[PDB]
Symmetry: C2
Subunit: 138 residues, 2 copies
């Protein structure tokens, strides 16, 4: 859900931004507010790299009392959970497409964060992999 | 999540559908298979009445191992949790729109199951009511 971000003071001023669970997400900001804003772009585009290399996305560490974090939207979170389950299911994209009865070009559209997908379509893909996706609130 | 269904033989032939948690969703079918399928529109059509009557939607009772059930899709499920949270907050539609910084015309689509709504918008509205919505995959 929420990825902790470590902010390091910069010797030339401002802050350098880094995530403990995602080494590829690096950026910086003038101020904590700006650094946090940039931190959300760094995390999501670092996710883009995992999606093309079909490598598992690390899950967030537990959050301490005084730590900043980035909460990924539900749309991103659902695709992240789907990608990890799909990579561990050991089936291909062609096979998954067959199971949902849809052409291969929306499997490509499914495992891409820049393409909008309806949450119900993500739910059906999880079901085809033997997984149930559900909601919790507070 | 999943609402338990009661299957009762019909004196007129066929089988009769009823939900333990939703007394208003009742219909029937010639066979168990058809009565279950017909039951899923009856539950969704009963939900529409809760949405326009602004009444809290009862949540499902626990499921035995050997229990029949109807599973609402994630899109409807998210809106059900949202309507219950909005009804218990005792604020108006104008106020919720103000807190998420969107016009009123997107609140009305939030509380309607026939209008598709993006999950990220449902997350934002829940947050404006002090609730955090998250996904579980099992």
């Amino acid at each position: 859900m929420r990825y902790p971000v470590t902010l390091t003071p910069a010797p030339e001023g401002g802050y350098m931004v880094s995530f403990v669970d995602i080494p590829e997400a690096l950026t910086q900001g003038e101020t904590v507010a700006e650094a946090m804003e940039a931190a959300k772009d760094a995390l999501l585009t670092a996710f883009d790299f995992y999606f093309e290399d079909n490598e598992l996305i690390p899950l967030p560490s537990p959050l301490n009392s005084h730590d900043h974090f980035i909460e990924v939207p539900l749309s991103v979170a659902s695709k992240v959970l789907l990608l990890n389950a799909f990579l561990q299911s050991e089936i291909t994209q062609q096979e998954l497409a067959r199971r949902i009865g849809k052409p291969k070009q929306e499997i490509t559209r499914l495992f891409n964060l820049h393409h909008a997908t309806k949450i119900d379509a993500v739910q059906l893909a999880a079901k085809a992999l033997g997984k149930e996706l559900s909601l919790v609130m507070v």
